[PDB]
Write a protein that binds this DNA or RNA. Structure first.
Ligand SMILES: [Mg+2]
Ligand SMILES: [Zn+2]
Lengths: 52, 71, 196, 153, 190
RNA sequence: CAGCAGGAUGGUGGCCAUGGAAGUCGGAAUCCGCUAAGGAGUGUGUAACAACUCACCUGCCGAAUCAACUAGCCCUGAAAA
């Protein structure tokens, strides 16, 4: 039902991110500070929860 | 182990109010003596180790302690 | 770390100024990890290894510019990494005999081809597959009773022509390799002399 | 037809599921008789998967034993092996005899992939630390324990 | 602090002759001309040499906030030369699991209808930017190739059909659909 | 100091070990021996390896990194009829 390469292509734009602990935004995976202002460029970051 | 006491006290700073500072002394242990001076004086037998502390010997007391230190 | 063998060359510098007056000045391309290998039995006592870094490629050689002092011209010579694998005995047959133990490659997209590539007259040893790799590039391959055989001796890369990427599957399906990989000896330097 | 084949036989341990069908099987000779006589030709290892070489000839396949030095380390270290139970914290240890440094040499000279009896004092320590034993400290302590204070040729 | 001088230069190959009147540059060559005006940045563009073989840009008396403007014009100029000599070709695939994605081009390369996305009968009348000529690929099952010269008109219109087709109210770790972008490339090759 | 870069295991396929694992699985351990290069692997892969890259090291150019003072202003912190 699906090719695991095009699927590797669609994990990149949706499921490899880094999330702030304060404003729940979605950052590019190699990032250290949030690009927003309503959290103050906070350095609390997590990975996005992988599928169960 | 010096780079884990700044980290322990950086956390202890979140229970007290106000503002306080972390300072590394220039002494040796829980004494009132300096850093380098301590081993040349113990070596010339002016100070005596007593567990957590140390006693100071002057040149003032009577002589029989001196003889009980050298002999 | 980055402090530990940094100070031990400028003690072990001179151990080879005064000993070994003869080098084969080899030019460093594709010194591999799988293809410098099946060689041992020509080179037993004619050779050495020791350090070398570009960071003192200057400093300790100018510190050495003083014993036999006509000693400058190597630096416009090595345009890259060129290792001076020493030798001791022969004048001409170690310039020669490093030719007889090398083992070639899998047909790879990624090397350079300076000379002619030949493709043999041989079957592939397989069944009904896709002939578009032979019939779009210009090679006569036809289905031959299950097997696929190279019909005519079609050459791919002639003398001094670059390697195309999608033209490796014919020799890879034959498991037969164009030329012998390994390491190339480049220059000569003997006792105040140079060649080209 | 001469085909020296690599097999990983389980030595003196008669195996349950061996690795003989995708390697020797499609030739025509049966590897079921040989897997037992090879463990018989091993005998007193019984623990160790010393790899046994087999050379397929036109008549049959022969048996050859390939000696080591790190399995002569397991010869110098004679511990009880374990059964099928296969429980962790297994890594053996002990004391290697200084004349077993001599005698592991006198069987790692047929291979001869090293230097002589005084050039034997690394082989029984620096892989012996990954198999599990030390002669009074690892190779770093047996630096000053072995540097030029010996009496062994 | 105040840094006194910072500059950067660009070499130009000789299939292209460039000039500038004031601050807006024009670059013409094999595929057409492009003009881009830099009148909000306040730098000095100098064009040294007979035959005009390279360019140089300066900025006197600038802080950290405007030493950034030395390189990010050299980039929009190397992109100005590439979009005239070579020209851009964005290739983008089309992931679908169960329903068929239908893709149809209206207006000879200047409009895209999209049908049958997640079973939605709602067609998406996506318009391009003037400058970009789309196409269905060849020698591939599902693929679009967008072609053009200006990269700014190419990539934004490429991301439009990437954001036109999204997923409402559900997972996007499981519902992975859409026309995604695969490879950024040029028309012809050096 | 970033990367348009040439590649990482002939003893062994560790010991006892997983049915099959060779580093790609579990365990006291963790080394020095042509070793500019040991890691019984940071890791993918494979029923196992095979095939790969990398911690550490080897090619091309004209000046940087780790914490810590909240040290000054600026912002988030900061909800009314
Ligand atoms: Mg719902
Ligand atoms: Zn945030």
């Amino acid at each position: 039902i699906i090719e695991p390469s095009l699927r590797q292509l669609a994990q990149k734009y949706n499921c490899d991110k880094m999330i702030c602990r304060k404003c729940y935004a979605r950052l590019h995976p190699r990032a250290v500070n949030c690009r927003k202002k309503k959290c103050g460029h906070t350095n609390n970051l997590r990975p996005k929860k992988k599928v169960k | 182990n010096k780079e884990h006491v700044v980290e322990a006290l950086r956390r202890a700073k979140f229970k007290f109010p106000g503002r306080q500072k972390i300072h590394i002394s220039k002494k040796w242990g829980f004494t009132k003596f300096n850093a380098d001076e301590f081993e040349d004086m113990v070596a010339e037998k002016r100070l005596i180790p007593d567990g957590c502390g140390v006693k100071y010997i002057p040149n003032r007391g009577p002589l029989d302690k001196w003889r009980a230190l050298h002999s | 770390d980055r402090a530990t063998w940094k100070s031990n060359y400028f003690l072990k510098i001179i151990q080879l100024l005064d000993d070994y007056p003869k080098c084969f000045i080899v030019g460093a391309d594709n010194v591999g990890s799988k293809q410098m290998q099946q060689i041992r039995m020509s080179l037993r006592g004619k050779a050495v290894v020791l350090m070398g870094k570009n960071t003192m490629m200057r400093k300790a050689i100018r510190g050495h510019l003083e014993n036999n002092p006509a000693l400058e011209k190597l630096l416009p010579h090595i345009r890259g990494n060129v290792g001076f694998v020493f030798t001791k005995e022969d004048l001409t047959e170690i310039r020669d005999m490093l030719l007889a133990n090398k083992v070639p490659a899998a047909a790879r997209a990624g090397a350079i081809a300076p000379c002619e590539v030949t493709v043999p007259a041989q079957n592939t040893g397989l069944g009904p597959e896709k002939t578009s790799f032979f019939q779009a590039l210009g090679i006569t391959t036809k289905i031959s009773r299950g097997t696929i055989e190279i019909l005519s001796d079609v050459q791919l890369i002639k003398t001094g022509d670059k390697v195309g990427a999608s033209e490796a599957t014919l020799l890879n399906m034959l498991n037969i390799s164009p030329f012998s990989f390994g390491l190339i000896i480049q220059q000569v330097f003997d006792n105040g002399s140079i060649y080209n | 037809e001469i085909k020296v084949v690599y097999l990983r036989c389980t030595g003196g341990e008669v195996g349950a599921t061996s690795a003989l069908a995708p390697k020797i099987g499609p030739l025509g000779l049966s590897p079921k008789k040989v897997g037992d006589d090879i463990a018989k030709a091993t005998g007193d290892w019984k623990g160790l998967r010393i790899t046994v070489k087999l050379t397929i000839q036109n008549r049959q396949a022969q048996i050859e034993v390939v000696p080591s030095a790190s399995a002569l380390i397991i010869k110098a270290l004679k511990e009880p092996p374990r059964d099928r139970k296969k429980q962790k914290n297994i890594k053996h240890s002990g004391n290697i005899t200084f004349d077993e440094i001599v005698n592991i040499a006198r069987q790692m000279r047929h291979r001869s992939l090293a230097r002589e009896l005084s050039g034997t004092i690394k082989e029984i320590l620096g892989t012996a630390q990954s198999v599990g034993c030390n002669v009074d400290g690892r190779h770093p302590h047996d630096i000053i324990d072995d540097i030029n204070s010996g009496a062994v040729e | 602090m105040k840094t006194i001088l910072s500059n950067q230069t660009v070499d130009i190959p000789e299939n292209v002759d460039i000039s500038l009147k004031g601050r807006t540059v024009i670059v013409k060559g094999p595929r057409g001309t492009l003009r881009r005006d830099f009148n909000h940045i306040n730098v000095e563009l100098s064009l040294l040499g007979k035959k005009k073989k390279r360019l140089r840009v300066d900025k006197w008396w600038g802080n950290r906030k405007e030493l950034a403007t030395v390189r990010t014009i050299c980039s929009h100029v190397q992109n100005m030369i590439k979009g005239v000599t070579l020209g851009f070709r964005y290739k983008m695939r089309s992931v679908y699991a169960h329903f068929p994605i239908n893709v149809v081009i209206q207006e000879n390369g200047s409009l895209v209808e999209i049908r049958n996305f997640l079973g939605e009968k709602y067609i998406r009348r996506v318009r391009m930017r003037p400058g970009v000529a789309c196409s269905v690929s060849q020698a591939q099952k599902d693929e679009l190739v967008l072609e053009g010269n200006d990269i700014e008109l190419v990539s934004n219109s490429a991301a439009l059909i990437q954001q036109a087709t999204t997923v409402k109210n559900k997972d996007i770790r499981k519902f992975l659909d859409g026309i995604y972008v695969s490879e950024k490339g040029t028309v012809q090759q050096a």
